[PDB]
Input
Amino acid sequence: MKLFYKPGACSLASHITLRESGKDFTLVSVDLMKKRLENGDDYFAVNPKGQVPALLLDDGTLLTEGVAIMQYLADSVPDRQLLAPVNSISRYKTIEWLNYIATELHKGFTPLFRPDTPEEYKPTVRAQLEKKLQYVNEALKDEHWICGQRFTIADAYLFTVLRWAYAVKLNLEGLEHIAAFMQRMAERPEVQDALSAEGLK
Amino acid sequence: MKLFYKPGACSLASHITLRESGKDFTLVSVDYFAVNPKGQVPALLLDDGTLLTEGVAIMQYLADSVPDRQLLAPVNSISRYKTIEWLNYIATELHKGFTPLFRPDTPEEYKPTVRAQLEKKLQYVNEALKWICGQRFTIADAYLFTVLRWAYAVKLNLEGLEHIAAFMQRMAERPEVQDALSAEGLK
Ligand SMILES: N[C@@H](CCC(=O)N[C@@H](CS(=O)(=O)O)C(=O)NCC(=O)O)C(=O)O
Ligand SMILES: N[C@@H](CCC(=O)N[C@@H](CS(=O)(=O)O)C(=O)NCC(=O)O)C(=O)O
Output
Protein backbone atom coordinates (compact mmCIF):
# COMPACT_ATOMS: atom_id res chain seq x y z
CA MET A 1 0.00 0.00 0.00
CA LYS A 2 1.28 3.54 -0.92
CA LEU A 3 0.46 7.02 0.38
CA PHE A 4 1.20 9.80 -2.08
CA TYR A 5 2.02 12.85 0.13
CA LYS A 6 3.89 16.12 0.43
CA PRO A 7 5.75 16.85 3.74
CA GLY A 8 3.47 18.95 5.96
CA ALA A 9 0.56 19.03 3.53
CA CYS A 10 -3.03 17.86 4.39
CA SER A 11 -1.91 14.30 3.57
CA LEU A 12 -0.25 14.21 7.01
CA ALA A 13 -3.72 13.50 8.44
CA SER A 14 -3.97 10.25 6.43
CA HIS A 15 -0.32 9.43 7.30
CA ILE A 16 -1.12 9.71 11.01
CA THR A 17 -4.28 7.58 10.56
CA LEU A 18 -2.23 4.92 8.75
CA ARG A 19 0.10 4.73 11.78
CA GLU A 20 -2.74 4.78 14.32
CA SER A 21 -4.40 1.95 12.36
CA GLY A 22 -1.21 -0.28 12.59
CA LYS A 23 -0.79 -0.77 8.81
CA ASP A 24 2.43 -1.09 6.85
CA PHE A 25 2.80 1.36 3.96
CA THR A 26 5.17 3.12 1.67
CA LEU A 27 5.43 6.95 1.45
CA VAL A 28 5.78 8.45 -2.10
CA SER A 29 6.50 12.19 -2.17
CA VAL A 30 4.94 14.36 -4.86
CA ASP A 31 6.22 17.69 -6.22
CA LEU A 32 2.97 19.64 -6.30
CA MET A 33 4.37 22.52 -8.38
CA LYS A 34 5.42 20.21 -11.24
CA LYS A 35 3.00 17.36 -10.49
CA ARG A 36 5.91 14.94 -10.53
CA LEU A 37 7.26 12.07 -8.40
CA GLU A 38 10.93 11.66 -7.52
CA ASN A 39 11.25 8.98 -10.26
CA GLY A 40 10.13 11.55 -12.87
CA ASP A 41 6.71 9.98 -13.58
CA ASP A 42 3.59 12.07 -14.24
CA TYR A 43 1.55 12.16 -11.01
CA PHE A 44 -1.65 12.98 -13.03
CA ALA A 45 -1.44 9.36 -14.30
CA VAL A 46 -1.83 8.13 -10.64
CA ASN A 47 -4.35 10.75 -9.42
CA PRO A 48 -6.04 12.72 -12.26
CA LYS A 49 -7.10 15.48 -9.79
CA GLY A 50 -3.33 16.05 -9.22
CA GLN A 51 -3.68 16.52 -5.43
CA VAL A 52 -2.37 14.77 -2.31
CA PRO A 53 -3.24 12.60 -0.49
CA ALA A 54 -3.90 9.59 -2.60
CA LEU A 55 -3.85 5.95 -1.24
CA LEU A 56 -3.15 3.07 -3.61
CA LEU A 57 -4.28 -0.25 -2.19
CA ASP A 58 -2.58 -3.57 -2.77
CA ASP A 59 -5.35 -4.65 -5.16
CA GLY A 60 -4.87 -1.51 -7.33
CA THR A 61 -7.78 0.58 -5.99
CA LEU A 62 -6.88 4.33 -5.84
CA LEU A 63 -8.62 6.30 -3.11
CA THR A 64 -8.50 10.10 -3.07
CA GLU A 65 -9.93 12.70 -0.67
CA GLY A 66 -8.38 12.67 2.81
CA VAL A 67 -11.70 12.28 4.63
CA ALA A 68 -12.60 9.15 2.55
CA ILE A 69 -9.16 7.68 3.03
CA MET A 70 -9.37 8.23 6.78
CA GLN A 71 -12.87 6.60 7.07
CA TYR A 72 -11.71 3.62 4.97
CA LEU A 73 -8.74 3.12 7.30
CA ALA A 74 -10.75 3.58 10.55
CA ASP A 75 -13.47 1.16 9.39
CA SER A 76 -10.77 -1.52 8.81
CA VAL A 77 -9.81 -1.60 12.51
CA PRO A 78 -13.04 -1.19 14.56
CA ASP A 79 -11.31 -2.23 17.84
CA ARG A 80 -9.02 0.89 17.68
CA GLN A 81 -12.10 3.11 17.94
CA LEU A 82 -10.75 5.72 15.49
CA LEU A 83 -14.41 6.23 14.49
CA ALA A 84 -17.45 5.01 16.46
CA PRO A 85 -19.69 2.29 14.93
CA VAL A 86 -22.12 2.71 12.00
CA ASN A 87 -25.49 4.16 13.10
CA SER A 88 -24.09 5.54 16.35
CA ILE A 89 -24.67 9.27 16.75
CA SER A 90 -21.10 9.94 17.93
CA ARG A 91 -19.94 8.55 14.49
CA TYR A 92 -21.87 11.24 12.73
CA LYS A 93 -20.62 13.92 15.15
CA THR A 94 -17.07 12.85 14.20
CA ILE A 95 -18.13 13.11 10.51
CA GLU A 96 -19.53 16.56 11.21
CA TRP A 97 -16.07 17.63 12.54
CA LEU A 98 -14.32 16.09 9.48
CA ASN A 99 -16.51 18.09 7.08
CA TYR A 100 -16.06 21.31 9.09
CA ILE A 101 -12.30 20.86 9.05
CA ALA A 102 -12.35 19.98 5.34
CA THR A 103 -14.51 22.89 4.15
CA GLU A 104 -14.00 25.61 6.73
CA LEU A 105 -10.35 25.20 7.85
CA HIS A 106 -8.39 23.15 5.25
CA LYS A 107 -10.01 24.95 2.31
CA GLY A 108 -9.93 28.16 4.35
CA PHE A 109 -6.11 28.03 4.36
CA THR A 110 -5.70 26.92 0.72
CA PRO A 111 -5.78 30.39 -0.85
CA LEU A 112 -2.74 31.32 1.26
CA PHE A 113 -0.82 28.45 -0.47
CA ARG A 114 -1.73 29.18 -4.11
CA PRO A 115 0.17 31.36 -6.68
CA ASP A 116 -3.00 32.47 -8.48
CA THR A 117 -4.22 34.15 -5.25
CA PRO A 118 -3.97 37.99 -5.35
CA GLU A 119 -1.71 39.30 -2.64
CA GLU A 120 -4.12 42.00 -1.69
CA TYR A 121 -6.72 39.30 -0.80
CA LYS A 122 -4.55 37.53 1.84
CA PRO A 123 -5.40 39.85 4.75
CA THR A 124 -9.13 39.01 4.19
CA VAL A 125 -8.42 35.24 4.29
CA ARG A 126 -6.29 35.62 7.49
CA ALA A 127 -9.01 37.58 9.19
CA GLN A 128 -11.57 34.88 8.30
CA LEU A 129 -9.26 32.16 9.64
CA GLU A 130 -8.71 33.99 12.96
CA LYS A 131 -12.48 34.05 13.59
CA LYS A 132 -12.79 30.32 12.78
CA LEU A 133 -9.99 29.62 15.27
CA GLN A 134 -11.98 31.38 17.97
CA TYR A 135 -14.76 28.81 17.29
CA VAL A 136 -12.41 25.81 17.26
CA ASN A 137 -10.85 26.95 20.54
CA GLU A 138 -14.26 27.17 22.21
CA ALA A 139 -15.17 23.73 20.82
CA LEU A 140 -12.06 22.31 22.54
CA LYS A 141 -13.00 23.84 25.96
CA ASP A 142 -13.05 20.50 27.80
CA GLU A 143 -9.26 20.04 27.07
CA HIS A 144 -9.26 16.42 25.86
CA TRP A 145 -10.05 15.66 22.17
CA ILE A 146 -12.53 17.32 19.79
CA CYS A 147 -15.38 14.73 20.11
CA GLY A 148 -15.22 13.18 23.59
CA GLN A 149 -12.31 11.44 25.38
CA ARG A 150 -11.63 9.01 22.48
CA PHE A 151 -8.91 9.83 19.90
CA THR A 152 -10.32 9.76 16.36
CA ILE A 153 -9.49 10.57 12.76
CA ALA A 154 -11.01 14.03 13.39
CA ASP A 155 -8.21 14.77 15.87
CA ALA A 156 -5.56 13.64 13.33
CA TYR A 157 -7.12 16.03 10.72
CA LEU A 158 -7.56 19.04 13.00
CA PHE A 159 -4.00 18.70 14.29
CA THR A 160 -2.69 18.54 10.72
CA VAL A 161 -4.53 21.71 9.62
CA LEU A 162 -3.94 23.74 12.81
CA ARG A 163 -0.13 23.32 12.28
CA TRP A 164 -0.68 25.74 9.39
CA ALA A 165 -1.83 28.49 11.79
CA TYR A 166 1.65 28.48 13.20
CA ALA A 167 3.35 28.28 9.76
CA VAL A 168 1.56 31.37 8.35
CA LYS A 169 1.76 33.14 11.75
CA LEU A 170 -1.92 33.88 12.38
CA ASN A 171 -2.72 35.63 15.72
CA LEU A 172 -3.30 32.80 18.29
CA GLU A 173 -3.00 34.88 21.48
CA GLY A 174 -5.03 33.41 24.31
CA LEU A 175 -6.28 30.41 22.35
CA GLU A 176 -5.20 28.16 25.23
CA HIS A 177 -7.39 25.14 24.39
CA ILE A 178 -5.87 24.88 20.89
CA ALA A 179 -2.45 25.08 22.62
CA ALA A 180 -3.36 22.23 25.05
CA PHE A 181 -4.69 20.16 22.13
CA MET A 182 -1.62 20.61 19.96
CA GLN A 183 0.57 19.66 22.93
CA ARG A 184 -1.45 16.46 23.76
CA MET A 185 -1.38 15.46 20.06
CA ALA A 186 2.39 16.05 19.58
CA GLU A 187 3.15 13.69 22.46
CA ARG A 188 1.41 10.72 20.79
CA PRO A 189 4.09 8.23 19.53
CA GLU A 190 2.24 7.65 16.28
CA VAL A 191 2.12 11.36 15.53
CA GLN A 192 5.80 11.85 16.54
CA ASP A 193 6.64 8.97 14.18
CA ALA A 194 4.71 10.62 11.28
CA LEU A 195 6.32 14.00 11.87
CA SER A 196 9.80 12.40 11.86
CA ALA A 197 9.20 10.41 8.71
CA GLU A 198 8.04 13.55 6.87
CA GLY A 199 11.15 15.51 8.01
CA LEU A 200 9.08 17.81 10.18
CA LYS A 201 10.87 18.02 13.51
CA MET B 1 -37.07 15.42 12.79
CA LYS B 2 -36.88 19.10 11.70
CA LEU B 3 -34.82 20.25 8.70
CA PHE B 4 -33.57 23.85 8.93
CA TYR B 5 -33.19 24.97 5.30
CA LYS B 6 -33.22 27.88 2.81
CA PRO B 7 -34.85 27.24 -0.65
CA GLY B 8 -31.92 27.47 -3.09
CA ALA B 9 -29.28 26.36 -0.63
CA CYS B 10 -26.93 23.42 0.03
CA SER B 11 -29.71 22.16 2.31
CA LEU B 12 -31.71 20.79 -0.69
CA ALA B 13 -29.31 17.80 -0.72
CA SER B 14 -30.27 16.82 2.82
CA HIS B 15 -33.98 17.38 1.97
CA ILE B 16 -33.79 15.00 -1.10
CA THR B 17 -32.04 12.45 1.12
CA LEU B 18 -34.80 12.59 3.77
CA ARG B 19 -37.40 12.00 1.01
CA GLU B 20 -35.39 9.23 -0.59
CA SER B 21 -34.88 7.62 2.85
CA GLY B 22 -38.59 7.65 3.77
CA LYS B 23 -38.36 10.01 6.81
CA ASP B 24 -41.08 12.32 8.17
CA PHE B 25 -39.83 15.74 9.07
CA THR B 26 -40.59 19.40 9.06
CA LEU B 27 -38.94 22.22 7.12
CA VAL B 28 -37.96 25.49 8.79
CA SER B 29 -36.85 28.59 6.89
CA VAL B 30 -33.75 30.51 7.99
CA ASP B 31 -32.71 34.08 6.96
CA TYR B 32 -30.70 31.06 14.65
CA PHE B 33 -27.30 31.17 16.50
CA ALA B 34 -29.20 29.80 19.55
CA VAL B 35 -29.99 26.67 17.44
CA ASN B 36 -26.71 26.28 15.44
CA PRO B 37 -23.70 28.36 16.77
CA LYS B 38 -22.24 28.27 13.18
CA GLY B 39 -25.28 30.12 11.75
CA GLN B 40 -25.42 27.92 8.64
CA VAL B 41 -27.77 25.63 6.82
CA PRO B 42 -28.34 22.79 6.83
CA ALA B 43 -29.09 21.64 10.33
CA LEU B 44 -31.09 18.53 11.25
CA LEU B 45 -32.91 18.46 14.59
CA LEU B 46 -33.35 14.92 15.80
CA ASP B 47 -36.16 13.79 18.08
CA ASP B 48 -34.05 13.74 21.28
CA GLY B 49 -33.41 17.43 20.66
CA THR B 50 -29.87 16.80 19.34
CA LEU B 51 -28.65 18.89 16.41
CA LEU B 52 -26.57 17.58 13.54
CA THR B 53 -24.92 20.08 11.21
CA GLU B 54 -22.86 19.54 8.01
CA GLY B 55 -24.83 18.19 4.98
CA VAL B 56 -22.26 15.47 4.40
CA ALA B 57 -22.71 14.18 7.96
CA ILE B 58 -26.55 14.45 7.86
CA MET B 59 -26.71 12.53 4.57
CA GLN B 60 -24.54 9.64 5.87
CA TYR B 61 -26.58 9.39 9.13
CA LEU B 62 -29.80 9.15 7.11
CA ALA B 63 -28.54 6.73 4.47
CA ASP B 64 -27.07 4.42 7.08
CA SER B 65 -30.43 4.36 8.93
CA VAL B 66 -31.99 2.73 5.80
CA PRO B 67 -29.42 0.33 4.37
CA ASP B 68 -31.84 -1.60 2.06
CA ARG B 69 -32.36 1.56 0.00
CA GLN B 70 -28.66 1.60 -1.03
CA LEU B 71 -28.25 5.39 -0.68
CA LEU B 72 -24.81 4.53 0.79
CA ALA B 73 -23.17 1.14 0.57
CA PRO B 74 -22.03 -0.80 3.64
CA VAL B 75 -18.83 -0.37 5.64
CA ASN B 76 -15.70 -2.06 4.20
CA SER B 77 -17.11 -1.95 0.67
CA ILE B 78 -15.14 0.03 -1.92
CA SER B 79 -18.34 1.54 -3.31
CA ARG B 80 -19.02 3.19 0.12
CA TYR B 81 -15.61 4.95 0.07
CA LYS B 82 -16.15 6.00 -3.56
CA THR B 83 -19.43 7.69 -2.47
CA ILE B 84 -17.64 9.33 0.48
CA GLU B 85 -14.89 10.45 -1.91
CA TRP B 86 -17.54 12.16 -4.08
CA LEU B 87 -19.21 13.77 -1.05
CA ASN B 88 -15.90 15.32 0.05
CA TYR B 89 -14.99 16.41 -3.50
CA ILE B 90 -18.30 18.11 -3.90
CA ALA B 91 -18.06 19.75 -0.44
CA THR B 92 -14.49 21.05 -0.71
CA GLU B 93 -13.98 21.54 -4.48
CA LEU B 94 -17.41 22.54 -5.78
CA HIS B 95 -19.61 23.85 -2.93
CA LYS B 96 -16.79 25.85 -1.27
CA GLY B 97 -15.73 26.80 -4.81
CA PHE B 98 -19.04 28.61 -5.39
CA THR B 99 -19.18 30.24 -1.99
CA PRO B 100 -16.86 33.19 -2.86
CA LEU B 101 -19.28 34.11 -5.76
CA PHE B 102 -21.87 35.09 -3.12
CA ARG B 103 -20.05 36.79 -0.18
CA PRO B 104 -19.48 40.57 -0.13
CA ASP B 105 -15.88 40.54 1.27
CA THR B 106 -14.69 38.86 -2.00
CA PRO B 107 -12.78 41.15 -4.44
CA GLU B 108 -13.83 41.29 -8.15
CA GLU B 109 -10.25 40.38 -8.94
CA TYR B 110 -10.35 36.94 -7.22
CA LYS B 111 -13.54 36.17 -9.19
CA PRO B 112 -12.16 35.11 -12.64
CA THR B 113 -9.82 32.69 -10.88
CA VAL B 114 -12.71 31.14 -8.83
CA ARG B 115 -14.92 30.65 -11.94
CA ALA B 116 -12.08 29.20 -14.01
CA GLN B 117 -11.08 26.79 -11.29
CA LEU B 118 -14.78 25.78 -11.14
CA GLU B 119 -14.99 25.43 -15.00
CA LYS B 120 -12.05 23.08 -14.74
CA LYS B 121 -13.65 20.95 -12.01
CA LEU B 122 -16.87 20.68 -14.08
CA GLN B 123 -14.94 19.23 -17.03
CA TYR B 124 -13.74 16.55 -14.58
CA VAL B 125 -17.33 15.94 -13.28
CA ASN B 126 -18.67 15.71 -16.89
CA GLU B 127 -16.07 13.04 -17.71
CA ALA B 128 -16.83 11.09 -14.51
CA LEU B 129 -20.49 10.91 -15.56
CA LYS B 130 -19.69 9.65 -19.09
CA TRP B 131 -25.24 8.14 -11.79
CA ILE B 132 -22.02 9.65 -10.34
CA CYS B 133 -20.85 6.48 -8.59
CA GLY B 134 -22.18 3.24 -10.22
CA GLN B 135 -25.66 2.00 -11.31
CA ARG B 136 -27.38 2.93 -8.01
CA PHE B 137 -28.66 6.37 -6.86
CA THR B 138 -26.77 7.64 -3.82
CA ILE B 139 -26.39 10.54 -1.52
CA ALA B 140 -23.52 11.74 -3.75
CA ASP B 141 -26.02 12.15 -6.58
CA ALA B 142 -28.23 14.20 -4.31
CA TYR B 143 -25.44 16.61 -3.35
CA LEU B 144 -23.98 16.86 -6.87
CA PHE B 145 -27.40 17.76 -8.24
CA THR B 146 -27.89 20.45 -5.61
CA VAL B 147 -24.61 22.15 -6.21
CA LEU B 148 -24.80 21.92 -10.06
CA ARG B 149 -28.08 23.87 -9.96
CA TRP B 150 -25.87 26.81 -8.88
CA ALA B 151 -23.56 26.33 -11.87
CA TYR B 152 -26.60 27.00 -14.03
CA ALA B 153 -27.69 29.92 -11.77
CA VAL B 154 -24.38 31.94 -11.93
CA LYS B 155 -24.00 31.19 -15.65
CA LEU B 156 -20.80 29.16 -15.71
CA ASN B 157 -19.76 27.96 -19.13
CA LEU B 158 -21.23 24.46 -19.43
CA GLU B 159 -20.84 24.23 -23.15
CA GLY B 160 -20.07 20.77 -24.37
CA LEU B 161 -20.78 19.25 -20.94
CA GLU B 162 -23.59 17.05 -22.15
CA HIS B 163 -23.23 14.38 -19.45
CA ILE B 164 -23.87 17.03 -16.84
CA ALA B 165 -26.97 18.17 -18.73
CA ALA B 166 -28.35 14.64 -19.08
CA PHE B 167 -27.64 14.03 -15.31
CA MET B 168 -29.65 17.16 -14.41
CA GLN B 169 -32.55 15.79 -16.48
CA ARG B 170 -32.46 12.27 -15.04
CA MET B 171 -32.34 13.78 -11.48
CA ALA B 172 -35.30 16.11 -12.11
CA GLU B 173 -37.40 13.09 -13.23
CA ARG B 174 -36.98 11.33 -9.78
CA PRO B 175 -40.38 11.68 -8.00
CA GLU B 176 -38.74 12.40 -4.58
CA VAL B 177 -36.52 15.05 -6.21
CA GLN B 178 -39.59 16.67 -7.84
CA ASP B 179 -41.38 16.60 -4.43
CA ALA B 180 -38.45 18.26 -2.68
CA LEU B 181 -38.16 20.98 -5.32
CA SER B 182 -41.93 21.45 -5.05
CA ALA B 183 -41.94 21.79 -1.20
CA GLU B 184 -39.16 24.43 -1.38
CA GLY B 185 -41.17 26.52 -3.94
CA LEU B 186 -38.81 25.85 -6.85
CA LYS B 187 -39.34 24.26 -10.30
N1 LIG C 1 -10.42 17.84 -1.63
C1 LIG C 1 -9.01 17.35 -1.46
C2 LIG C 1 -8.02 18.53 -1.26
C3 LIG C 1 -6.56 18.05 -1.14
C4 LIG C 1 -5.59 19.26 -1.04
O1 LIG C 1 -6.15 20.46 -1.48
N2 LIG C 1 -4.30 19.03 -1.61
C5 LIG C 1 -3.35 20.12 -1.78
C6 LIG C 1 -2.26 20.00 -0.75
S1 LIG C 1 -2.74 20.95 0.76
O2 LIG C 1 -2.60 22.57 0.31
O3 LIG C 1 -4.37 20.93 1.09
O4 LIG C 1 -1.52 20.72 1.88
C7 LIG C 1 -3.08 19.96 -3.27
O5 LIG C 1 -2.56 18.68 -3.53
N3 LIG C 1 -2.33 20.98 -3.93
C8 LIG C 1 -2.03 20.85 -5.34
C9 LIG C 1 -3.23 20.98 -6.27
O6 LIG C 1 -4.33 21.78 -5.77
O7 LIG C 1 -2.73 21.58 -7.44
C10 LIG C 1 -9.12 16.37 -0.30
O8 LIG C 1 -9.67 16.94 0.86
O9 LIG C 1 -8.03 15.53 0.01
N1 LIG D 1 -19.39 23.32 6.04
C1 LIG D 1 -20.86 23.54 6.01
C2 LIG D 1 -21.12 24.80 5.16
C3 LIG D 1 -22.60 25.06 4.92
C4 LIG D 1 -22.82 26.17 3.90
O1 LIG D 1 -21.68 27.00 3.77
N2 LIG D 1 -24.02 26.92 4.20
C5 LIG D 1 -24.28 28.26 3.68
C6 LIG D 1 -25.39 28.30 2.61
S1 LIG D 1 -24.87 27.67 0.97
O2 LIG D 1 -23.92 28.84 0.09
O3 LIG D 1 -23.93 26.24 1.16
O4 LIG D 1 -26.31 27.36 0.07
C7 LIG D 1 -24.53 29.09 4.96
O5 LIG D 1 -25.84 28.86 5.51
N3 LIG D 1 -24.27 30.51 4.78
C8 LIG D 1 -24.00 31.42 5.89
C9 LIG D 1 -23.94 32.89 5.42
O6 LIG D 1 -24.48 33.07 4.09
O7 LIG D 1 -24.66 33.76 6.32
C10 LIG D 1 -21.58 22.25 5.59
O8 LIG D 1 -21.01 21.80 4.39
O9 LIG D 1 -23.03 22.20 5.50
